Structures are given as structure tokens and as C-alpha cells.
Amino acid sequence: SSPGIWQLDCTHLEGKVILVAVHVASGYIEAEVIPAETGQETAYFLLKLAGRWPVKTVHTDNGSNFTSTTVKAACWWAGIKQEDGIPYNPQSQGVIESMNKELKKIIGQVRDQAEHLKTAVQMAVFIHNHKRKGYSAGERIVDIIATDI
Amino acid sequence: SSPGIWQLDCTHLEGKVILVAVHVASGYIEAEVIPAETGQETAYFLLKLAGRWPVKTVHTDNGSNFTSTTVKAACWWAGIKQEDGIPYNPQSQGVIESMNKELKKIIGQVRDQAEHLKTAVQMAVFIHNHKRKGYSAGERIVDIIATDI
Ligand SMILES: Cc1c(Cl)ccc2sc(N)nc12
Ligand SMILES: Cc1c(Cl)ccc2sc(N)nc12
Incomplete structure (x- = not known):
């Protein structure tokens, strides 16, 4: 069921980790800066996400998070079906890679307005979700x- | 325009601060635990919220946040009209008070499942937004x- 499908994406900047969840059908995102991509951080991020949107299926970003008992506990708690994120469809890689490049571009455009990276990341989430492409990602997910x- | 109206609500538990935004027309919430209710924390919370939902108007929770230059900068950045939160309608007090009591109840029911208060708070956000009252708050906001x- 495509309305409930999200994909996890972990990218790096300034020696820090940016964790992104993408609503696949719309391109809508939520994101956070974390010190490191642990099971505990990923678990907490998913719990927040699923309290805010009806998350049915998550394609995890790597095998460590797929395996993590803490991530599995969060998916159980929140009613999320945890799946691998193997791009059986090859264009899935490229869409995420492009979004990572776009997000990093936006972060660069706002970076000086923000004292801390986390502020710049949330500015980028805002700009990404509002951008009209015609509808915005926010409009499409709703x-x-x-x-x- | 009622679809875009949110209300800030700050409540306390375990010597910590829980900041809540309520979508007035639906009862849908987002919430975070913070060390203290500063302008900077409130500003960052609003930035996150407005990147995720189309926030047009915010009724701020007190005069310090209404006055805060940092909160005003975030509202300017994110396109939010900052208003006072004076309950010209007297039932507005009681609805928030009730929600605070309900949230604290849920937190109590899950508290032992969570090592940290922030996890319990996000479990409570999840339960609150999914609860069928008939539709859930999540269903209504969408x-x-x-x-x-
Ligand atoms: C900007 C936006 C977000 Cl971030 C999420 C949902 C919707 S619905 C709409 N008209 N705009 C939005
Ligand atoms: C559970 C839920 C949330 Cl938290 C937000 C929006 C919607 S729409 C729907 N059917 N469920 C939801």
C-alpha cells in the first residue's frame, strides 16, 4: 500500500550524520541531525515519524539497521513493517542520491543563516517540502x- | 483560515519541559522534550513544525515567546503569523488543560517501557494522534x- 511506504536515507556532512525519511510516492521528507547512526537513534527517529504520519512500511537504509534489535523493537511498537531497502528497482538509488545532492545544495544556500547545522537541515526540509514542481511534496503526501x- | 492554525502549549513533568503544538481544528499534535523553554528552543521547534505541515498562524503559549526576537525571526523565516494565545474563547484554556492531563496519563502508562522521558513523550504523541474518537486526529488533520x- 503505497500511501504508507517510507524509505530511510543516511547522508553525511561536516563530520555529522543526517538521517532522512522519504515518503516514496510524494517525495516528502522528515530529517534530523544525529551524532552517529546507531540503532537507538534510528529507532527513536522512526517512533517520532510514525506518531506523525501513518507509516506502514519502512525500507531501512542498511543491513545494520535492518538487523538492529532496537530498530526492530521500535517497528514492532509503532506497527511498522520493516523491510530491506534493496533497490530491486535500479532507479531508486538514483532518486535518493539526487535528493541528497539537492538537500546538501539547499543546506549550503542557507548555511550562513544558521549557527548550527541542525537549523540549516530543518530549513532545507522546509524548502524541500514546499518547493512547487504543479504541486509541492507536502501537497502530494496529504x-x-x-x-x- | 482554520486549516493553518496551531497553538503552542508548554507543560512540565519530571522537572523537564514538554513543548506541544496542537493543530486546533483536528487535535493533532507534535511534541518535544526540552531542557527549558527558551526563545531559541521554541524557534527551532516552530521551524521543524512548519517544514512538516502548512503552518500559517501560531498562537504562542506566553508573552515571553510572543516577545522573543528569536521566535519572531523563526516565524518570519517560516512564513508564520505569530499571534497571542489569549483565550478570547474561554473553553480554549480547558481543552489544552485536558489534553495536558491526557498526555501525562499516557506518558504514565508507557513510562516504564521507556528509558528516557523523550521516548515516552513520543509514544504519547503516537497514541494521541492515532486514537479513534469516528476518526483519529491524524485522519482529521489530513x-x-x-x-x-
Ligand atoms: C507545505 C506543506 C507541508 Cl510541509 C505538508 C503538507 C502540506 S499540504 C499543503 N498545502 N502544504 C503542505
Ligand atoms: C495515524 C495518522 C497520523 Cl499520525 C497522521 C495522519 C494520518 S492520516 C491516517 N489515516 N492516519 C494518520
């Missing part, structure tokens, strides 16, 4: 999920 | 905003 209800 | 688009 339409997709409303129709599903 | 319907309200989809109709508005």
Missing part, C-alpha cells in the same frame, strides 16, 4: 493519504 | 488540509 482514507 | 488544497 492528497495521497486523504484519498487513501 | 482531511482538513486536503479539502483546503
